[PDB]
């Protein structure tokens, strides 16, 4: 029985301006009875209403998640949010706290690239985006084409890893189609990170050809 509490994705925090945090509870074998998820704030201010989902697993276990919407301003100014899981099976309660990452801040460097034509697969092209030397690790990445964001499941993004120096880095990959660069041969790799100033955005354009 383990429990996790995430931070708001910088996109929901700085772009959508409706950040949320999710308290995830995987309890492996679930005995009889329900498991409770209660929230709290360091300031004692009320919590908003949280949405909850439970999903039965194929390896016999139960996934229970609770998502709390938080204030953009409340988060930046350093509010601490706390999740408490109680299970009648469990003797004592589980608790996970979350708050803004404290440490040095450094905006990300963004580079985009295009693959040349490879023989055979000549109606597909892969775009690559290196985003490095940023702190903290919290980062969101989206790909824009013709002034509109592409569906989030169109691209990949690696887990953040450490550079030789201080920052983190992530690679992002996006397959694009011939019909897409012939409509408008311009793709934007955008990174949302708390240290980028202002509006927390760094981006780069790439063209195939």
């Amino acid at each position, epitope marked *: 029985v383990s429990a996790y509490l995430s931070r708001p994705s910088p996109f929901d925090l700085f772009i959508r301006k409706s950040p949320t945090i999710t308290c995830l509870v995987v309890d492996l074998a679930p005995s009889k009875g329900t498991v409770n998820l209660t929230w*709290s704030r360091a*300031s*004692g201010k009320p919590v908003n209403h949280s949405t909850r989902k439970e999903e039965k697993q194929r390896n016999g276990t139960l996934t229970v998640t609770s998502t709390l919407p938080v204030g953009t301003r409340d988060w930046i100014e350093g509010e*601490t949010y*706390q999740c*408490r899981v109680t299970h009648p099976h469990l003797p*004592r*309660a589980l608790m996970r706290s979350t*708050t803004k990452t404290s440490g040095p801040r450094a905006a990300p460097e963004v580079y985009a690239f295009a693959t040349p034509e490879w023989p055979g697969s000549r109606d597909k092209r892969t775009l690559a985006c290196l985003i490095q030397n940023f702190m903290p690790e919290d980062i969101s990445v989206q790909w824009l084409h013709n002034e509109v964001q592409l569906p989030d499941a169109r691209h990949s993004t690696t887990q953040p890893r450490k550079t030789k120096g201080s920052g983190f880095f992530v690679f992002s990959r996006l397959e694009v189609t011939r019909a897409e660069w012939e409509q408008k041969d311009e793709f934007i790799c955008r990174a949302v990170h708390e240290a980028a100033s202002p509006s927390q955005t760094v981006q780069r354009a790439v063209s195939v050809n």
Partner: antibody
Amino acid sequence: SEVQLVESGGGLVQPDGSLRLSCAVSGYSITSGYSWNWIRQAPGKGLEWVASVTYDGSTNYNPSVKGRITISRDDSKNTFYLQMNSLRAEDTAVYYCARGSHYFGHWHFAVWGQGTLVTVSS
Amino acid sequence: GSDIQLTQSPSSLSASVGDRVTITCRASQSVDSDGDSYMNWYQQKPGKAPKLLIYAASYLESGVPSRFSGSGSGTDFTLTISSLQPEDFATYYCQQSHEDPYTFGQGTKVEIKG
């Protein structure tokens, strides 16, 4: 940035008189709090929680002093005050001002001021 | 009378740097509720204000060294300093946040050997 609490008004004090101490909160708005408490430490005795006020003005007092005690605040100065009258010997203490944090309906005092010394005479 | 009373033991103890030090707090009435134990630990060096070490019996306050651990349940609680450091010598208080009014313990001094 960081929250600082600075007490003022402590000094030599007359018996059956009254007392007024202030706490200049700098760095956080007591209107956006967090509970705001007074906790004293009488010579050769444990700490005694005395009073509190939350961000929405809700007040609480320790029954052992409820009656000759009042906790007030002045949002315009971001200061909150403690008033005690009808003073006796057990009021000789070091008075602390402290900002409690919230845990599912329960509070713990996470930030304190240096405190100020108050002595009642004979 | 009608206040949850806190008793600490030992009243006082001297140790050396590197030692493991254990301080007990026993409450007159249970302070458990909703699966937690509302018992907080404070450190206070002479002339200075208290400092919050552990809240809700066993959770470490932000930026507090990992050598402080708290444990217990019901009416018995234990603060543990795993490896006593030179800046750890101070008086230690417990305090319940379960029922008004909030009450503290009498204190436990942690002195150096020489």
